[PDB]
Amino acid sequence: KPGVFSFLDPLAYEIWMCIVFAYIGVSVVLFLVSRFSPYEWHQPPNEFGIFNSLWFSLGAFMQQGCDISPRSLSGRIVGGVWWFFTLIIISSYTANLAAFLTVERMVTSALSLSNVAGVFYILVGGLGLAMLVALIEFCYKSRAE
Amino acid sequence: SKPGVFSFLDPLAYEIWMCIVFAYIGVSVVLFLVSRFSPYEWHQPPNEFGIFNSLWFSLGAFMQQGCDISPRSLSGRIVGGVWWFFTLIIISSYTANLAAFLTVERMVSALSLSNVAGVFYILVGGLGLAMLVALIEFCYKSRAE
Amino acid sequence: SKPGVFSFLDPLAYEIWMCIVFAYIGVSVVLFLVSRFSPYEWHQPPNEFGIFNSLWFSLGAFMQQGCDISPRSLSGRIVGGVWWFFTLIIISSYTANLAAFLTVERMTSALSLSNVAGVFYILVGGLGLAMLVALIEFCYKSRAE
Amino acid sequence: KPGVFSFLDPLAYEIWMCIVFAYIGVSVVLFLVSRFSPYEWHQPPNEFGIFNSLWFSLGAFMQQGCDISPRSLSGRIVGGVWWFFTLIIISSYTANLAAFLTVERMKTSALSLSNVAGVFYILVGGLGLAMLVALIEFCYKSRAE
Amino acid sequence: GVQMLLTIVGAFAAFSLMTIAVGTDYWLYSRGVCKTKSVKNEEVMTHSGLWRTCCLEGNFKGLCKQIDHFPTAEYFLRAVRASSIFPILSVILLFMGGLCIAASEFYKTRHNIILSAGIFFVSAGLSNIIGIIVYISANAGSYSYGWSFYFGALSFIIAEMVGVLAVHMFIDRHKQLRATA
Amino acid sequence: GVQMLLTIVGAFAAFSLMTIAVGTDYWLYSRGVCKKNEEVMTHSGLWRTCCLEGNFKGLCKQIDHFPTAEYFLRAVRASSIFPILSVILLFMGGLCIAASEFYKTRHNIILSAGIFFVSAGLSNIIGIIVYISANAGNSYSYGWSFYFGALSFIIAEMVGVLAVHMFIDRHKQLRATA
Amino acid sequence: GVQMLLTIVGAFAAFSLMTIAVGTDYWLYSRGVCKEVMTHSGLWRTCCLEGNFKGLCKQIDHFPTAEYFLRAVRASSIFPILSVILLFMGGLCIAASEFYKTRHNIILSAGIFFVSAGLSNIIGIIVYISANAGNSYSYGWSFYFGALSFIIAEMVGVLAVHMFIDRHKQLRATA
Amino acid sequence: GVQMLLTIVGAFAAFSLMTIAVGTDYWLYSRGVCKTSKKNEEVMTHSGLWRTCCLEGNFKGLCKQIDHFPTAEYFLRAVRASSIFPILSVILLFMGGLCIAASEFYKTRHNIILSAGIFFVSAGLSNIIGIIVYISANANSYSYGWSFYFGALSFIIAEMVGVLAVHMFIDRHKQLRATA
Numbered sequence A: 001k002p003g004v005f006s007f008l009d010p011l012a013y014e015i016w017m018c019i020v021f022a023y024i025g026v027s028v029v030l031f032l033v034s035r036f037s038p039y040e041w042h043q044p045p046n047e048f049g050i051f052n053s054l055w056f057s058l059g060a061f062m063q064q065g066c067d068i069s070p071r072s073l074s075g076r077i078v079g080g081v082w083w084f085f086t087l088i089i090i091s092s093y094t095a096n097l098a099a100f101l102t103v104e105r106m107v108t109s110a111l112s113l114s115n116v117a118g119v120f121y122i123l124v125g126g127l128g129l130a131m132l133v134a135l136i137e138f139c140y141k142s143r144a145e
Numbered sequence B: 001s002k003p004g005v006f007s008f009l010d011p012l013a014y015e016i017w018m019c020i021v022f023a024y025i026g027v028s029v030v031l032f033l034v035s036r037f038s039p040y041e042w043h044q045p046p047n048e049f050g051i052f053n054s055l056w057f058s059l060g061a062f063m064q065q066g067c068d069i070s071p072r073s074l075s076g077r078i079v080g081g082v083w084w085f086f087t088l089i090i091i092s093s094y095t096a097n098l099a100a101f102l103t104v105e106r107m108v109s110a111l112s113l114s115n116v117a118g119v120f121y122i123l124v125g126g127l128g129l130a131m132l133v134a135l136i137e138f139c140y141k142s143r144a145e
Numbered sequence C: 001s002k003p004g005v006f007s008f009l010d011p012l013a014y015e016i017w018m019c020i021v022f023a024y025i026g027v028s029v030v031l032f033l034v035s036r037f038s039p040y041e042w043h044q045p046p047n048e049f050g051i052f053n054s055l056w057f058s059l060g061a062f063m064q065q066g067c068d069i070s071p072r073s074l075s076g077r078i079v080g081g082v083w084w085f086f087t088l089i090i091i092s093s094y095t096a097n098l099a100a101f102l103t104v105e106r107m108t109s110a111l112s113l114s115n116v117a118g119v120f121y122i123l124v125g126g127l128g129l130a131m132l133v134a135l136i137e138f139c140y141k142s143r144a145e
Numbered sequence D: 001k002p003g004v005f006s007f008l009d010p011l012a013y014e015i016w017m018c019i020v021f022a023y024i025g026v027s028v029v030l031f032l033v034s035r036f037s038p039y040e041w042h043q044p045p046n047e048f049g050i051f052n053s054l055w056f057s058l059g060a061f062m063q064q065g066c067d068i069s070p071r072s073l074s075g076r077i078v079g080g081v082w083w084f085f086t087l088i089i090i091s092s093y094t095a096n097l098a099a100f101l102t103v104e105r106m107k108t109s110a111l112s113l114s115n116v117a118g119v120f121y122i123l124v125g126g127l128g129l130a131m132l133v134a135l136i137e138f139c140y141k142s143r144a145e
Numbered sequence E: 001g002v003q004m005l006l007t008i009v010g011a012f013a014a015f016s017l018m019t020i021a022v023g024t025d026y027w028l029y030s031r032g033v034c035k036t037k038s039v040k041n042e043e044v045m046t047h048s049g050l051w052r053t054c055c056l057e058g059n060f061k062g063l064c065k066q067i068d069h070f071p072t073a074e075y076f077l078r079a080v081r082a083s084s085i086f087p088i089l090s091v092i093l094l095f096m097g098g099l100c101i102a103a104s105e106f107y108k109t110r111h112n113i114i115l116s117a118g119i120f121f122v123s124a125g126l127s128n129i130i131g132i133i134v135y136i137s138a139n140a141g142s143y144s145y146g147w148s149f150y151f152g153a154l155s156f157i158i159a160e161m162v163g164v165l166a167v168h169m170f171i172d173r174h175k176q177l178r179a180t181a
Numbered sequence F: 001g002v003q004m005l006l007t008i009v010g011a012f013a014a015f016s017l018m019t020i021a022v023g024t025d026y027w028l029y030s031r032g033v034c035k036k037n038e039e040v041m042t043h044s045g046l047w048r049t050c051c052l053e054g055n056f057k058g059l060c061k062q063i064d065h066f067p068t069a070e071y072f073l074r075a076v077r078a079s080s081i082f083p084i085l086s087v088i089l090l091f092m093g094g095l096c097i098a099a100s101e102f103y104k105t106r107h108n109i110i111l112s113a114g115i116f117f118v119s120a121g122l123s124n125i126i127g128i129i130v131y132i133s134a135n136a137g138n139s140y141s142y143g144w145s146f147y148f149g150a151l152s153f154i155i156a157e158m159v160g161v162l163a164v165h166m167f168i169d170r171h172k173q174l175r176a177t178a
Numbered sequence G: 001g002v003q004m005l006l007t008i009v010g011a012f013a014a015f016s017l018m019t020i021a022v023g024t025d026y027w028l029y030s031r032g033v034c035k036e037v038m039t040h041s042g043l044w045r046t047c048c049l050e051g052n053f054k055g056l057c058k059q060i061d062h063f064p065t066a067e068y069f070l071r072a073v074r075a076s077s078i079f080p081i082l083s084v085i086l087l088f089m090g091g092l093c094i095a096a097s098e099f100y101k102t103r104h105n106i107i108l109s110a111g112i113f114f115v116s117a118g119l120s121n122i123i124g125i126i127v128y129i130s131a132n133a134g135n136s137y138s139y140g141w142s143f144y145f146g147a148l149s150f151i152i153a154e155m156v157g158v159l160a161v162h163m164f165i166d167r168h169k170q171l172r173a174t175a
Numbered sequence H: 001g002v003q004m005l006l007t008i009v010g011a012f013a014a015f016s017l018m019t020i021a022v023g024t025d026y027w028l029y030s031r032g033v034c035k036t037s038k039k040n041e042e043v044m045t046h047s048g049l050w051r052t053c054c055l056e057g058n059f060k061g062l063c064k065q066i067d068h069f070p071t072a073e074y075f076l077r078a079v080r081a082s083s084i085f086p087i088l089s090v091i092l093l094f095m096g097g098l099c100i101a102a103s104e105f106y107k108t109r110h111n112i113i114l115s116a117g118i119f120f121v122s123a124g125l126s127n128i129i130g131i132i133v134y135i136s137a138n139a140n141s142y143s144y145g146w147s148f149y150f151g152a153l154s155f156i157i158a159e160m161v162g163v164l165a166v167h168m169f170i171d172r173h174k175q176l177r178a179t180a
């Protein structure tokens, strides 16, 4: 039986720790360039604040939908390199995951739930955390009233 | 041999295909809950994340295809951010494990329409259901006037 | 071992490619129909799903690209949902089977330009056709002036 | 030891060079067919100048970017062919990479930071370049007051 | 006016094309036989359609046999493939689309007889996709499709184009009513 | 209200199904011993595995458990903490429903009901996942008790959205009066 | 204006570079026969590199239906030559744009010519590489001049379109 | 007000963490030698950026040097030996703190605060490169040590100070707009 969090095997511990560091760095460089200059504020020149920058850098990495898109030169450079980074990494994961599966299957074979059971705990755990965060916000404002 | 009509669901076990539906129905409801349970937010619904648009969002996020409206609060984003991670692994596990089947069974000592013929019936069947839903409404709206 | 111009179509059989075209022409028409057939929704186009935008949305969906217009009714969304599922399976099958075609050579090297050169021809051909379609119109407008 | 820039081995140097040449090409054509018409400017007919065309093309190749999409037959032919080109090429890189990993290019191991190392230098180098571009623009504007 | 003329011509074309496909035999240039048992076989090129199969070449050029479609989820496929319900239901739906189009030329007041035509044509096209897949899928478990199969494929395109055109006509009628009221 | 009736009926249904599941022994039709022996068909469950078509038809024996990270999962599956927890949360959801019909000025009770039902659904998912994952170490088919638990989840989640709407409607009415 | 000067200098650079490329002999440094050692081949001649002779610009045996069409193109080199023609025609237009100021529709013609010239050069590169891939080989200065010409031409094709746009903006402003 | 307080404390913490990291020797718990016959014996060691100090065996405490040099590969080794990037982050964080200190004295030049923001953000970027160049050059088990985590933690504490400083710049210029 495989480890609960065995879906993180097609990449090394040092690549996940570095992906998080690169994510944080990109989201703080994107914010910086967009909003540092005081010759663009009217209201803010764009919607790329610190909170939104994390969201757009997480969304970009997950190859998901849009809410905003950089419109400056400096900001677009950050976007471009981040998209290229994501491409390689996501391709590498899928490619190396298939390697793991194919070599393991040569030494039906439909992926059992035990193989991918940590993405479900994380999912329900995040849903649990999300509700809790919402209720903390609600309780705070409710008491203030 | 004779690949079964629904042989495109092989790359993942039955319990994964079941728990994905459960997780989808759960993420949508939790997204609906956090977004629209705050009496201290409506000034007229704050965000377009009702119960019917929270299922479209989740469906779009899983299928990859889909980019219309994204959460804008802290709670909603957490929900969408774990869902995005969930989708990534699951959609990279299908592809990777599908490749293993198509490689391992080839090494043994071009996909045909039959292999992917249970996804065409679903597509065409869905179009039929859609035309029945639309026409039903039309009829019910044309009778009342 | 010998490469062909249009050898990027090898994974999916001829019939699969043919039926994808038929399903694209079908989803698009059906999407148009539902959206715009009801005479109890216009007040002007209730949505942007004409006969031209529907074709673009279907093509977009399949190519895993952006969402200019997004379905909002119940019948449109059903059509969209099944189309997104079809696309997913089909695009995962191409990649999965291409990884097989590039391993276990039966009668590893870095893909050369000769393997993906038919695509470049189609790309340049499309650009040429687009410029023509744009200058034909231009001329037509010019004479009317 | 796996070279720093070992994320470019799937596709040949020519393919990489030709992608860049085709990217420039597509961008120029998408700008031309969209803005040359004297009978559409009422205020340009759309946001597809030479800068946004490059951004659209770049985003479309990376499988990200939901800023804008063409709204003209001439500009939608370019879009469609570019999306098709992208699909093939990105699938080719994700499939040929899995061939390299699965078949040792001399059990399986987990990709190490050494393997995907030039994608973090590019990213960090790009972030540096982005800030530099931003600061020089701000410095220039600050010397113009 | 002109839009209805295109629709009429296109309606007939798709119906005609599809009826010529379901009736002809030049669907699949296979490699089989044309005869049965006797008191060896002759594997020669055989243009085989839906119902009959004549040997293009060979000593028995022009002898058509009755395709034997029955030599859980596989029985159902055979039955559908054997009865060609989908390629025959497309012909039934395209014909009903023509009746609806013709009826709307004598009863102009009823605007809902034009929408019906559109749905019939669109649904006929969708039934001709299941026919294509069923055909190919069942035929699987060297060949070259012929002109009869391409008329069936071409019928779809023509029908779908008539389908959108009929929907456009329906909308146009109702737009006139929303401007004169 | 008609909406209130749906919630009440749906709440009871969810609770019923889930409790019937945890208590019955028809979760997984397998082929193993029930008392060196023979592998007759059996209908295992959560707390017991009772062979079905066998010489000792109707003999039921406590599921043999425990035969640090692996230790944690064993304890979670053995105690069925999650399946049981879902029942408890579903029960409390019903109590909240049967409390907004008396203290109908608070309206936070209905929101509690919603969260309880929605959180009882999430507990149910983890219970299913833990059950499917411990059955790792050929003829494993799922029975009606397993599908009653799964059916409860859907029924619970539907009550959850319904309750949130019921809560939202209360506040919308209060907003109009102001 | 400043834009016109660049459009002219750029056009010359593009045309000149590409003409040099088509005419030179240092496209791909290979290892083959020159009558087996290194041989800097080109588009029309494969000239020997070092050895008993060092200098012998032999001809290419381009011809030792998906392999006859490719060969025909590669051999005739239509596409590389076609780019040169289109770059030349774009230059005439710029020059004609001075004399016949009134006719603003000549500037756009130059833009299309330059843009289409780049697209012909793209097919050139692909056709060349694809057929020549029929040994450690490296691309010489001549090949990069061809590739650099494409870039310069595309840049002169956007600038021309801007100049055409600006013409019409002045027409729509004053009137 | 209190926003500046966090920045100062956070900037000091980031600086302090990184300096400890570089100077210490507990980066990589490997299994190697610590002594420059024809015999040998590999025992568990806690490597660092400069010295490989043994923590077990008869050589417990003997701190040997590391011959990083026993053209892509050369460049990697050259950078990894001098620790340019890890030390560069130290230099940048120290300079970024000077700017914040310089603020109180010169409260009429807003570019003092934005300078701190760029140094702190750029200090984080150097830290990323240092981690990568240490993990790539270094490549039978290993497990990074608290010293390596003080580096990683410094990056986070320096990126958070970076955004905080940039907000201070933004906020100050916003107050000027109001006065106008």
Ligand SMILES: CCCCCCCC/C=C/CCCCCCCC(=O)OC[C@H](O)CO
Pocket (backbone or CB within 6 Å): C006, C055, C056, C059, C122, D073, D076, D077, D080, D081, D084
């Ligand atoms: C308004 C919306 C308009 C959207 C417009 C988008 C157009 C995209 C076209 C892609 C064609 C790609 C497929 C090309 C198939 C070529 C087949 C071929 O060459 O076949 C060779 C044969 O198999 C052996 O010789």
Ligand SMILES: CCCCCCCC/C=C\CCCCCCCC(=O)OC[C@H](O)CO
Pocket (backbone or CB within 6 Å): A076, A077, A080, A081, A084, D005, D051, D054, D055, D058, D122
């Ligand atoms: C507005 C649009 C323009 C602005 C946004 C631009 C974003 C750039 C994106 C990706 C390129 C990243 C990779 C570039 C370098 C890859 C090739 C390379 O350096 O390869 C070296 C190798 O050693 C050779 O052998």
Ligand SMILES: CCCCCCCC/C=C\CCCCCCCC(=O)OC[C@H](O)CO
Pocket (backbone or CB within 6 Å): A005, A051, A054, A055, A058, A122, B074, B077, B078, B081, B082, B085
């Ligand atoms: C606007 C706010 C932004 C959105 C914020 C939420 C986004 C969450 C995304 C991904 C969660 C990934 C969780 C990964 C957990 C991995 C588990 C782990 O640490 O496993 C260690 C391993 O078991 C050792 O052996």
Ligand SMILES: CCCCCCCC/C=C\CCCCCCCC(=O)OC[C@H](O)CO
Pocket (backbone or CB within 6 Å): B006, B009, B014, B055, B056, B059, B122, C074, C077, C078, C081, C082, C085
């Ligand atoms: C309002 C927005 C909601 C729109 C929602 C659109 C849903 C369409 C999505 C996917 C199709 C999935 C269909 C799956 C059909 C079942 C397949 C099947 O029966 O597989 C055999 C067996 O179950 C295996 O063992």
Ligand SMILES: *C(=O)CCCCCCCCCCCCCCC
Pocket (backbone or CB within 6 Å): B135, B138, B139, B140, B142, E093, E112, E115, E116, E119, E120, E123
């Ligand atoms: C409600 O009042 C109905 C108005 C529209 C009627 C359209 C014609 C009937 C529906 C189509 C008939 C079925 C065709 C496909 C069958 C497989």
Ligand SMILES: *C(=O)CCCCCCCCCCCCCCC
Pocket (backbone or CB within 6 Å): C135, C138, C139, C140, C142, G086, G105, G108, G109, G112, G113, G116
């Ligand atoms: C319509 O108004 C035509 C007159 C205006 C000129 C528009 C077309 C100019 C470009 C002609 C084609 C250039 C060469 C194409 C083949 C490479």
